[PDB]
């Protein structure tokens, strides 16, 4: 539940090469979303024709909102009421929860924005933008602070409007849960002007009655509509019996939210909902558990693979993060720092160095491969990879496995039994073969997960070319030419390979029709 | 302060260690309690008193 | 600020009511805070003093008042009743945090009573009682007449009702009285924004957590907390549990930096016992790698019905109480107060079950009497009593009261982790006065009571007095193994004067002899060829 949770974006003020792909991305990410866990950034929408109805159901944003280079005449957040600003946007010193630059929109309408809990509001260089000066941010911006001219003549604020408007009409009037209030409830927000009409101290940006049960949103912790200092512990300590009892009423803490089950991208650990397990703890079935014996080794993911960080993956059983393999990876690539200042260039590396990933069994994020090199074929380096959890996904198509414009002839990663929670995108690999014939839902966990497989080497050319699945093997496909490379076998599986009848391979007892086993038979 | 005899089954077997059973009705309900013998305490007179 | 332990015998009483009165006076005088139920019953004579009530400020269980005929019952300082144990008439029906019944007082004055946190209030069939109908119990209870005699109006002074005649006696309001913004709490002025932190109990003198009267859950640093500072603190911005340098263990309504040490530590808490997922490790309530050692829960009373369960236990979680009825056998009663199954008499020979037992996490209580229940050698392999749960106001880890015992015989008992030794009125029991109990107890703060057992001189003449082979520390019985500590040499848990007495013994230490390797008869040393 939570209604619909989005993940916000970190990539900030960064320009996109293709404006249509970008719009398509934002539309995909935000549609039907009510609660954006992260930052919501509208960047580089230049076309005034664009349809921004994906903003239509957003009600709360945990991080910041960045609106930059947006040129559509009216930008409207019809239902957003709260910006938490748990993370704030600031340039290379002031820190923003709402920041609007270089946009050409005539009107920015947030008619129901009651409270910005943290960080400051800021506007910069928006020549057609209007009414912002009529707002009186001191009301909206918690902390009780005043926050940051247009080219046009600006429409008289509607007559209904008590003070200010976000735009034209009466539905754009600014509401005053805070300033309207009687002094008698200083340090809160009243639902009416009388001195008894105020709100529970937990309430954020409004409310309907005096109880913490009537809060619009809450400063503290929102448990299924009610607001509490703390989330009901999963284990509650009994003062009488001195025993840390298990709590039937227990919930997990997801941010300032209180949930029965933890969202897919997080792990539950000690009644909280964390992205990573602790050092002394093991991920298992979505829960941090004690790992029996010593804990298995892990290394963090890297934004781009290169000579500098390739060694760091030596002996890794789990990769906590993402893997991007780019032309840059092989080429060696010119680094850079956020300041935009140039960085060092790393001698290039060749594909053979990718054998580090031989010990790897799981990648918690996504696996991405767009690198090209004459010797970089097959992905047998990941021949022991079993699962890719799509705990974090790529920005477009929600991809957990995205192989794009790579110089690969085959995948070759058997043991890849599961991609949970992602979509697979394999496109434009000139000499990639096999991918067209793998039925990826067999590997995917939920039918709702999508697969895009377009623009690779023709399956017909691969037949002619010779490279197809073994004559053993069901219609599921194979990762490459070999006899072990098969997703599933028809005809009986023995060891890592498949044979027809346990008559072959000298000895083998058939303790299944679908499996055989070795002898020191029957 | 009226007190009455317990049902046979309770009279015989409710109170331990040579206690006597008494019964009161409070709110139309029978409550069976006990008069403990010297040196015993508890509801069924089961525990030995500590000095 | 004295604590006292509440009784739980309901309407039951001692035959001797003067004794009963004196029993209550002992228990409650100078008591600030009563842990458990306070049952004030069978004061049938007016003019009993009732002063012990004067100091009570909090009662964790229910308060029950029955068959009390003192004219005026006053709780001068009682302000909250937690009702964590409640009183009932049948298993179905209301459970009461306060119930007064069949009682002859003219007035029950509990002024200054602010809060009944859980459970309901009941008054049944008690004449002359007054002003209770005038009281708003909706104000005192979170959720849940025809007196026949006159009934004086409340003082003019006060606006609603009263507890009794004074202007001191009118009911005050801290709850119902203040602004609706305070749902869930009491409130210290009537303005909205003049409410007290939801963390405390029974009112408060201002808005902050340092300001309430009692702590609802935990008191730490003179500030009420709902939860002790966590060992791992969650961060909502980046979804991770951090390690908390400020973290503290929950120890029953207080937060302590280190646990008591006779207790275990569950993740954030000083605990008595590990839950089914987990198991003891040195200190910690660690999880079980594979299987979880099966364990043996303590029993409320040991009898022929439950004895079998204890077969093959190394650790008794809970305690062991062998009482008279254990040997005599008894009928059981279900929780309905319908009679249950009868239990045959236990035969002391059957206590052999405990010979496998090594540790007792609770307390050991022996009060049972029987012609063949002479020694306590069934516990010969018991080595520690943890005392994680103690017995009576004496706070005993080991209580032996009026048993038929003649000697203890518990050779391996090396430690009592916490709590006291109390051994009294055992008529032919010996050794117990000459046992230097401090040796056994873990801390010198722990106390011992040893009185009224078979007199030391009378043991001496009988010669049941303990080997020459053991020091001033005493002993559990007569034999050489029995001694707590060898006087001179120790060979195979046996106390010996000189290693040479046994040919097969060689002198390993200054206080030890070990037996000679099978190989040879008499050795100089500890070897296969050495002998």
Swiss-Prot record, chain A:
Ubiquitously expressed in embryos. In larvae, uniform expression is seen in wing disks, genital disk, anlagen of testis and ovary, and brain cortex. In eye-antenna disk, highest expression is anterior to morphogenetic furrow, levels remain high in photoreceptor precursor cells. This pattern is reversed in posterior eye disk. In adults expression is high in brain cortex and thoracic and abdominal ganglia. Keywords: ATP-binding, Developmental protein, Glycoprotein, Kinase, Membrane, Nucleotide-binding, Phosphoprotein, Receptor, Signal, Transferase, Transmembrane, Transmembrane helix, Tyrosine-protein kinase, Ubl conjugation. Its main location: membrane. Changing residue 265 to S: Reduced dissociation and increased binding to spitz. Increased binding to spitz. Coiled coil: none annotated. Residues 4-522 are extracellular. One of its GO terms (biological process) is neuron differentiation. It is found in: Membrane. One of its GO terms (cellular component) is basal plasma membrane. Changing residue 238 to A: In dim-arm; Does not form dimers even in the presence of spitz. Changing residue 237 to E: In dim-arm; Does not form dimers even in the presence of spitz. Glycans are attached at residues 32, 143, 315, 339, 378, 465, 495, 513. Receptor tyrosine kinase, binding ligands of the EGF family and activating several signaling cascades to convert extracellular cues into appropriate cellular responses. Known ligands include spitz, gurken, vein and giant-lens. Transduces the signal through the ras-raf-MAPK pathway. Critical for the proliferation of imaginal tissues, and for the determination of both the antero-posterior and dorso-ventral polarities of the oocyte. Belongs to the protein kinase superfamily. Tyr protein kinase family. EGF receptor subfamily. This is Epidermal growth factor receptor. It comes from Drosophila melanogaster (Fruit fly). The lineage of its organism: Eukaryota, Metazoa, Ecdysozoa, Arthropoda, Hexapoda. The gene is Egfr. The chain holds residues 100 to 631 of 1426 of the full protein.
UniProtKB/Swiss-Prot annotation, chain B:
It is found in: Cell membrane; Endoplasmic reticulum membrane; Golgi apparatus membrane. Proteolytic processing by Rhomboid occurs in the Golgi. Cleavage takes place within the transmembrane domain close to residue 144 and the active growth factor is released. Residues 2-46 form the EGF-like domain. Expressed throughout the embryo. Disulfide bonds join 6-21, 15-34, 36-45. Ligand for the EGF receptor (Gurken). Involved in a number of unrelated developmental choices, for example, dorsal-ventral axis formation, glial migration, sensory organ determination, and muscle development. It is required for photoreceptor determination. Interacts with Star via the lumenal domain. This is Protein spitz. It comes from Drosophila melanogaster (Fruit fly). The chain holds residues 77 to 126 of 234 of the full protein.
Curated annotation (Swiss-Prot), chain C:
One of its GO terms (biological process) is salivary gland development. GO terms for cellular component: apical plasma membrane; basal plasma membrane; plasma membrane; receptor complex. Residues 2-531 are extracellular. Ubiquitously expressed in embryos. In larvae, uniform expression is seen in wing disks, genital disk, anlagen of testis and ovary, and brain cortex. In eye-antenna disk, highest expression is anterior to morphogenetic furrow, levels remain high in photoreceptor precursor cells. This pattern is reversed in posterior eye disk. In adults expression is high in brain cortex and thoracic and abdominal ganglia. It is found in: Membrane. Ubiquitination by Cbl in response to high spi, promotes its interaction with Graf and thus facilitates its GPI-enriched endocytic compartment (GEEC) mediated endocytosis and its subsequent degradation. GO terms for molecular function: ATP binding; epidermal growth factor receptor activity; identical protein binding; transmembrane receptor protein tyrosine kinase activity. Changing residue 3 to A: Increased binding to spitz. Changing residue 33 to A: Increased binding to spitz. Glycans are attached at residues 30, 143, 312, 336, 375, 462, 492, 510. Changing residue 262 to S: Reduced dissociation and increased binding to spitz. Increased binding to spitz. Its main location: membrane. Keywords: ATP-binding, Developmental protein, Glycoprotein, Kinase, Membrane, Nucleotide-binding, Phosphoprotein, Receptor, Signal, Transferase, Transmembrane, Transmembrane helix, Tyrosine-protein kinase, Ubl conjugation. Changing residue 241 to D: In dim-arm; Does not form dimers even in the presence of spitz. Changing residue 251 to A: Reduced dissociation and increased binding to spitz. Increased binding to spitz. It comes from the Eukaryota. Disruption phenotype: Embryonic wound healing defects. RNAi-mediated knockdown in tracheal cells results in defective gas-filling lumen in terminal branches. Belongs to the protein kinase superfamily. Tyr protein kinase family. EGF receptor subfamily. This is Epidermal growth factor receptor. The gene is Egfr.
């Amino acid at each position: 539940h939570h209604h619909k949770i989005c993940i916000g974006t970190k990539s900030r003020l960064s320009v996109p090469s293709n404006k249509e792909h970008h719009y398509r991305n934002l539309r995909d990410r935000y549609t039907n979303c009510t609660y954006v866990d992260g930052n919501l950034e509208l960047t580089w929408l230049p076309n005034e024709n664009l349809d921004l109805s994906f903003l239509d159901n957003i009600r709360e944003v945990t991080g910041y909102i960045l609106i930059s280079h947006v040129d559509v005449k009216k930008v409207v957040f019809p239902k957003l009421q709260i910006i938490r600003g748990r993370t704030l946007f600031s340039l290379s010193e002031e820190k923003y929860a709402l920041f609007v630059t270089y946009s050409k929109m005539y009107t920015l309408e947030i008619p129901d924005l009651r409270d910005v809990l943290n960080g400051q509001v800021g506007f910069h260089n928006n020549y057609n933008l209007c009414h912002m000066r009529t707002i009186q941010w001191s009301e909206i911006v918690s902390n009780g602070t005043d926050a940051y001219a247009p080219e046009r003549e600006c429409p008289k604020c509607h007559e209904s409007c008590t003070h200010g408007c976000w735009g034209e009409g009466p539905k754009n009037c600014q509401k005053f849960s805070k300033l309207t209030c009687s002094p008698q409830c200083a340090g809160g927000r009243c639902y009416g002007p009388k001195p008894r009409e105020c709100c529970h101290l937990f309430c954020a940006g409004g409310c309907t009655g005096p109880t913490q049960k009537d809060c619009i949103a809450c400063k503290n912790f929102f448990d299924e509509g009610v607001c509490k200092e703390e989330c009901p512990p999963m284990r509650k300590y009994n003062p009488t019996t001195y025993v840390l009892e298990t709590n039937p009423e227990g919930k997990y803490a997801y941010g300032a939210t209180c949930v029965k089950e933890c969202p897919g991208h997080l792990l539950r650990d000690n009644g909280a909902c964390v992205r990573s397990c602790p050092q002394d703890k093991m991920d298992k079935g979505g829960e941090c558990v004690p790992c029996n014996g010593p804990c298995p080794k892990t290394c963090p993911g890297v934004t781009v693979l290169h000579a500098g960080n390739i060694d760091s993956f030596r002996n890794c059983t789990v990769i906590d993060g993402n893997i991007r393999i780019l032309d840059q990876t092989f080429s060696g690539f010119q680094d850079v720092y956020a300041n935009y200042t140039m960085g060092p260039r790393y001698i290039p590396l060749d594909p053979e160095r990718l054998e580090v990933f031989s010990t790897v069994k799981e990648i918690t994020g996504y696996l991405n491969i767009e690198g090209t090199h004459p010797q970089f074929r097959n992905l047998s380096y990941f021949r022991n990879l079993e699962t890719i959890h799509g705990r974090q996904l790529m920005e477009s198509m929600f991809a957990a496995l995205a192989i794009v414009k790579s110089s690969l002839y085959s995948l070759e990663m058997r043991n890849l039994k599961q991609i949970s929670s992602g979509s697979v995108v394999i496109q434009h690999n000139r000499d990639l073969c096999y991918v067209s014939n793998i039925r990826w839902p067999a590997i995917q966990k939920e039918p709702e997960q999508k697969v895009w497989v377009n623009e690779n080497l023709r399956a017909d050319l691969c037949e002619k070319n010779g490279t197809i699945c073994s004559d053993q093997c069901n219609e599921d496909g194979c990762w490459g030419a070999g006899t072990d490379q098969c997703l599933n076998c028809k005809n009986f599986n023995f060891n890592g390979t498949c044979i027809a009848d346990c008559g072959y391979i000298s000895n083998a007892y058939k303790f299944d029709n679908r499996t055989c086993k070795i002898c020191h038979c029957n | 302060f009226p007190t009455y005899k317990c049902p046979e089954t309770f009279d015989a077997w409710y109170c331990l260690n040579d206690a006597h059973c008494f019964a009161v009705k409070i709110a139309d309900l029978p409550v069976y309690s006990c008069e403990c013998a010297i040196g015993f305490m508890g509801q069924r007179c089961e525990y030995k008193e500590i000095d």
